[PDB]
Amino acid sequence: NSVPGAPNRVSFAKLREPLEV
Amino acid sequence: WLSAASFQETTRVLTDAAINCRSDKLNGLKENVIIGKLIPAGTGINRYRNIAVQPTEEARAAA
Amino acid sequence: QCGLPKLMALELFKPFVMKRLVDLNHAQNIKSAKRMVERQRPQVWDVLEEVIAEHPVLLNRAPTLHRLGIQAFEPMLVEGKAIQLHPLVCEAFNADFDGDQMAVHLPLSAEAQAEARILMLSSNNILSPASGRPLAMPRLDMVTGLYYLTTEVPGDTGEYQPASGDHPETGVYSSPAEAIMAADRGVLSVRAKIKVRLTQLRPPVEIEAELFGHSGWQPGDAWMAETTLGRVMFNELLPLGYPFVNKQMHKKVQAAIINDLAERYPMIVVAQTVDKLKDAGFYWATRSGVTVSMADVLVPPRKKEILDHYEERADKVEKQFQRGALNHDERNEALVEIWKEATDEVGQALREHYPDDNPIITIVDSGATGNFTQTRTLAGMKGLVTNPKGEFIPRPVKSSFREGLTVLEYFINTHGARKGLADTALRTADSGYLTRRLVDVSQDVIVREHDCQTERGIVVELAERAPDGTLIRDPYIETSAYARTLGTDAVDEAGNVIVERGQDLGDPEIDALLAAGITQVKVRSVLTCATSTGVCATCYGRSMATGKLVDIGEAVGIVAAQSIGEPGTQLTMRTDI
Amino acid sequence: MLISQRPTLSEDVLTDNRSQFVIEPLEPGFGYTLGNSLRRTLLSSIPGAAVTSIRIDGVLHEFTTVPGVKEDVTEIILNLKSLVVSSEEDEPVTMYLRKQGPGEVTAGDIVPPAGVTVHNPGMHIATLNDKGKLEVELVVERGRGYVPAVQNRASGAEIGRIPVDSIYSPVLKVTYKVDATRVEQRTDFDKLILDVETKNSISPRDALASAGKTLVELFGLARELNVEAEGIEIGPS
Amino acid sequence: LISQRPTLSEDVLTDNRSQFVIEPLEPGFGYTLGNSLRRTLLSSIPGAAVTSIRIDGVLHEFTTVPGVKEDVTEIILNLKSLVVSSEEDEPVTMYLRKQGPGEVTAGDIVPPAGVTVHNPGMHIATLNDKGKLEVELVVERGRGYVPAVQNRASGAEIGRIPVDSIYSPVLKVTYKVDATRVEQRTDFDKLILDVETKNSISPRDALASAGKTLVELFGLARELN
Amino acid sequence: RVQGPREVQIHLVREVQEVYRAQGVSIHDKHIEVIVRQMLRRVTIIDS
Amino acid sequence: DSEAVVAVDAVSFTLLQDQLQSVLDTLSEREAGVVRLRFGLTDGQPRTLDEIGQVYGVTRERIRQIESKTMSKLRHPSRSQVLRDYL
Amino acid sequence: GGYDTPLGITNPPIDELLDRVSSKYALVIYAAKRARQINDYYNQLGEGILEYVGPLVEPGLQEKPLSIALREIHADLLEHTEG
Amino acid sequence: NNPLSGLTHKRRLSALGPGGLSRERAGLEVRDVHPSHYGRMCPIETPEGPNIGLIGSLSVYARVNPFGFIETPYRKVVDGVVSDEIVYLTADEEDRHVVAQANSPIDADGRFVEPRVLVRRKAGEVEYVPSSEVDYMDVSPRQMVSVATAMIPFLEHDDANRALMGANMQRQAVPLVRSEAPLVGTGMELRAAIDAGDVVVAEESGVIEEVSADYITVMHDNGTRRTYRMRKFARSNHGTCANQCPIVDAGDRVEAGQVIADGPCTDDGEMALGKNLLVAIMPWEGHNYEDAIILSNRLVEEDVLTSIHIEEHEIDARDTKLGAEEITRDIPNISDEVLADLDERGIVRIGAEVRDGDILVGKVTPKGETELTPEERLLRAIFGEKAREVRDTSLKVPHGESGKVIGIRVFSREDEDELPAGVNELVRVYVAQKRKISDGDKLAGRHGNKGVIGKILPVEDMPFLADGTPVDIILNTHGVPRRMNIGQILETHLGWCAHSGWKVDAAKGVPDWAARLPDELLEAQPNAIVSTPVFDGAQEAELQGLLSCTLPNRDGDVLVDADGKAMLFDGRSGEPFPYPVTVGYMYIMKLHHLVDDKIHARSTGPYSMITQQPLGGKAQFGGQRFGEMECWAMQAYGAAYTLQELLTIKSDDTVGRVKVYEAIVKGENIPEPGIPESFKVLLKELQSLCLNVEVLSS
Ligand SMILES: [Mg+2]
Ligand SMILES: [Zn+2]
């Protein structure tokens, strides 16, 4: 997310991350 | 001296070969390659390089 | 043969193509022919084929580690822009197809043309000049295909089962044609133990002796054989006179067969047999059903229990260190030792668990590629990882690459990975320097005479005597006693001479010496040759590249220097000598 | 349209019945398409006759050996297996052969009923010795392809009649390979190299002609859907 | 011995695909027969496709038409999906014109007599008020896949834009066999060919063309005897 | 200096082959004997 | 190195000289001699009409007539179809 | 003599060729000098005949002089002496 | 070569340079991954050549201190409570404190479920520590890795050498003409693409007013408008296309930060370096032997892998001593045939195709006064042609180029353009070719499984599934295990799952294997995209579960079994393959190592100045280098005459090359060589060094 036109790419990530790139 | 100079430590080889007035014989294998003459190995030796080739008498007469 | 793009062969042969163009009245003169070539009119290709036919070309690959880095082939025009290479010369050239480039050279004079035709043709360099082992061997894929084709699977379809009362054995086949037809139908599998009657394949020595005795001419005889259709089809590729193999074609077995073939048969026959082997190996590797999948890489079941037990011992060591009993260095030694034992146990468990028809196990065991350590890394655990200095991490990784490594384990692995990657780069330059020094120091030694007629000679151990009493063969006999000329005679117990002075000392001679029971022989060598400049031929003995006595003009010094310096890249290091 | 180059078929006789065939030049790909079909058609589409079941007197359940001869039951079975026989009647026929005394028996000693012929009377079958008697029963019928030894479905109809694999196909071994003649001028057209090895019953050329006839009929089955359908036309003969 | 001749049935599934059942075949032969039929169907079925296009405002393929959303390369890529069938061997030309806002589809391009467009709902390019599109296309017969013929070989002008053409109305071919393999040794195969064509020609017609090519090719062995 | 030329030839050949064969690389001894022969050509002058 | 020999134009010039010698020999001795002396073929220095007339014992007007007729003859396609591609 | 029929560059079997000479160096010099003689004969055919003699074996249409020389060697129509 | 190449060339740390260590002085000690590199420099990505270890790249979360140290963010944990405060630490602080592990099992509240957690100590030691002593924790997994390596899916299963190769070879991918997005990847594609600067992004929100192939006008929320100019077919610094296609319609509304136009290697905003291709892992008839790759002809037909390459040519008509060069049609000693494509002013037409050896710009130079040969005089007199006292030096397209001409940019002195002194006219010609895929081209996946294209088979003779769909590429099985990169196998399986679409059947509860699977993942549409992160991604058990449910394509048919293999039919012979073969959708890219840039040949070209040897490299004509090792092999072969030929009458014999060319042309024997001009140069140099060298006959 955090990108208005981001295509919906479903993720396998288990744990959330607090800091963005 | 040519082989040693082309190999390694060319300055030190030349400065002492010149003092000795050393004269090469061009009989090795690197020297012939450097000076563009046939190497003395394989088909470059006199046993094979001086082969005489001519047809046999019977085949000569048959044509 | 070798592939050659027309867009480059035309530029290579431009003078010849211009001469032929002017000769065939396709251009009025050289200027017109040159303009025609530059514009690439559609008849220039027709002329180019004619002018290229029967004109050997040379292929070069940087680095040229040894003698076989230059070979001569007959070119054929092909589309595209890639120089097609025969798969069997990849071993000699040390060339994989990951983007490598090969140089091309063109002889002009008649001397150079015949020189590339005879001395440097690919079908005339099969054995490695260093050790005499073949280099036109079936490589990875061909070995896998032949191994699958000639392996025997018990309890397959259409086996030979002896039955009584109800019906006959229903497993015997009249001829390989009938066997092939039955395999074409859904009756016989390629790898089922059958009993065919062969009439054009030479039976082995023992069967020949039992049936035909002295005159066992394979051309007309008829005999019964218990083998598999795959092995019959494999034996069809070998020359007519060769005995039936009836084995499982491991890479070592194929090496032995090819070495014997090169020793006993003409080189043209050897090359044709090698080509047939390559074709059959590729065809049956396609159908071998060898594939990789995540469900194909089984993990050891008892890995969890083994890891828990070794972790318990490691925690015991950690506690005994925490109570101040042992110092840091010996503690590290203790963890390293226990984790090495853990790696051994896990590897043994994985080897036991893995089947014999697994694709990975077949690839490893057939001698195609890799070693069991890579399979252990694949399934099991990677094991110990080295430090940048060269030591070992006290904490070893526990997960294989199939299970996925954690961040810390990956970071630990990167140390050894990058260290080895840089070590290779340094080692290549060091080996090149060593080869360059050796070639010069040995550029003097060339064969000049045929026999120095000396009486000196070195002594070779040649299967020293065992204390219990027998002739135990010395393992290093193919690199220290083979391909040499016996300086003196070989006699024992004041009997008759087994091998007289001046013999090639081949495998039959070595076997006869062992049967007679003699241990030490004085053999002639270049260390004692009494020639003025260069060594003689008898002192040097048989040349490994040819298999016969060395010639009277060979650059044996440069050959030896290249042989020593080529494998310098694979010499690893041990973590005060 | 036009193939722009008519392929042709040429023969090359090696032995009395072993001729290799060359078909060239075919437009790319079609080499395999026609070659595999031709091989399979040769193997299992030509009518032929072969032995199906045999019976020897004095053998009921002891399948080890038979007295009076040297080569055993397995050897004699695989000897009858490679016996070329022709027939003109679809119904199964029965062969007779009988000899007395020691000596060597060949195919010529067989007595074929009117309607079957033997194409190799001088083939070695067995070796009689010690005033022995040989009385072998044979069942010969015509078929196609390769049929294994049919099991004795009938329980008490024939106790002594044992079955044997049947090689119906007149041809035995057929192999093929393709090449890439003239890649440059005419875009790597393909050439086929068939290798046919049959019995002495029929010539390899006759076998190829029969296979071609049945294959063109098989593909004309599909051709008879839209007669005026445009396709690639080779042209004249 | 089987003296029964095989037969070919038909099984329509949709307009542009169907199943063909051939029964009975010799054991172990249905696979090879279906493979040969599929290989011929997928490679040597005659059709018709666009050879070259010419746009008034452009001079090569790496430019942009003023107003349209896509570029000339994207227009070419879209046009490579067209399905057209011709009636004469000579190269005919067809025109496409559109002005002002709107979307240009494959139904808007007017074909001459003989040729036709089978997918009018195929999208070509998007237009706005300022844009204007005017292109001309050349339809040619043939077979297989031929790459773009170079402008130097022909005598065409600068505006001519050669386009890759794929004369192949067949789309996807598969098969499956049903080996009976009963204990009575009177076994046979049962081929089930599956043919799908891209609405240009019927699968029946494609199979007929393949059969004609195969009979003509296989008659070579028979003719010389 | 202590065992003559034959023993040093043997020792050099054995050591080089020991290192080369550790990685399973087989090289015939004569290829190293050539280099050893080139090594042991000259002699020193202890008395003019 | 632009001063080196092209290694193709050299053999082209050699064969051009050979063809020129042939096309000259297709004419007669008088014409070949006068044209060679005029254009300096056998020698580096090209002789003039006065020199040719002095050598051959005729006048420069006769030399000019011969030169003109030879130049007209050499422009025929039978003599220029081989020399056309050499320029 | 049990090999398949050779093709391409190795039309005359090299191993059968080597029975006529001592070593492959002698063989290659033999073939090279014979090919030189053949080429000189080809380039010296228009004018009067010199002691050079053309191919003894029947030559192919487009056949290299080196190949012709090798077939001459294999057919045993030449004799040579070393130095 | 692509936005990834640009982005990774930025953020690049090079240890070599002025004031830095050189390669010759670079010992093995510095080319190591010190334990202080975790989170500050990627241990994977680095050049694999002689510069191994001297060049690195910043990590994704790394930051630079004002002094020049490299910081790394961390979440400080207090009495076992993992806080959300982020504190940046350098190497000294990290060594001072105790850091946790990124994938530490937090209790979804701040505490650790297990007291014993993984820990990095001061000396880089890795231990198990009670949770009370831990005072720092990584922000997120994949922190230690760089961008290019973070773009590799299933990285944790790959080795390190092959991960290095894949990371280094992801930056050489060429931009294709379609550039579809990858099926299976990581979360570092969208961010990497939009942060690379090669994608137009609306700075202020609004509604799209006008959209076309050249420009976009975004109508802002408040009155003002703004127009963005796309870059249609702009030449990159390495000869690759740089198209920029809009991805919005005439009525859409865009928020400030949305991707408004694609780039060279982008799809719908995220990154796309290649295409998705059906994959087989069987060795096929030796054509895919030893890292050889087989391709279906469908890629050639539909231009799946087809790149556009733009080359430029520069020629300057400059002042000269004897006059001034001019650009004009009138070229000396030329025909009217080659002038057909030239316009009136001399340059070629826009859109006029060119071939190797054509005329691009017609430039003539004052030749001057030069003496002509008598034969030339005779020919000129015969044909009536004049002297033509100027020389022809026209811009000819070099050997081995083709393609159309896009645009011509011509400068002049008369129109007041900033030109270098002495140059009166400059003109640039841009030539572009649509290169197809062909044998010899280099292909590679994302796990460093490279390989050239061995043979492009037709569509019919390729293995196909039960439904008739033929595979597109055919790898080799032997290359997978010994390279330790089963990450490609996992990617293949996940790609097949993504392409087919799956549905976890939770009729009786959610299955145990999918217990930790996130929501909206139990079922997916066909051709759906997934995103497995670098060090926290799809597990093997989850992959098995997904492969279990592989909802059928069109009929009732599951073409891929549970193991991940399939029943392929041989399209050449016809019989089915006797054993199942793995299939799936791997993501492969076309590398910038094309055949057309590598193939070279030379018969006789230019020669060097001091020595008379031929030049080198493809830029000039140049010849291959016959090195010392090749000479050693030539000698060892017992060979003399070939060595003499290659060393005398092919490289240096000035009076020998012309003679051998003449002999070859005329059909005569090759003449005997002479001594080398290089040896003569060496003799002269020795004589110049006050060393009397005399060559003696007897
Ligand atoms: Mg390589
Ligand atoms: Zn000696």
CSV table of C-alpha atoms and ligand atoms in Angstrom, one decimal, chain C residues 61 96 98 100, ligand 1:
chain,number,residue,atom,x,y,z
C,61,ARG,CA,39.5,-20.3,-26.3
C,96,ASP,CA,30.4,-24.0,-21.0
C,98,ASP,CA,27.0,-19.5,-20.4
C,100,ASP,CA,31.7,-17.9,-23.7
J,1,MG,MG,31.7,-20.1,-19.3
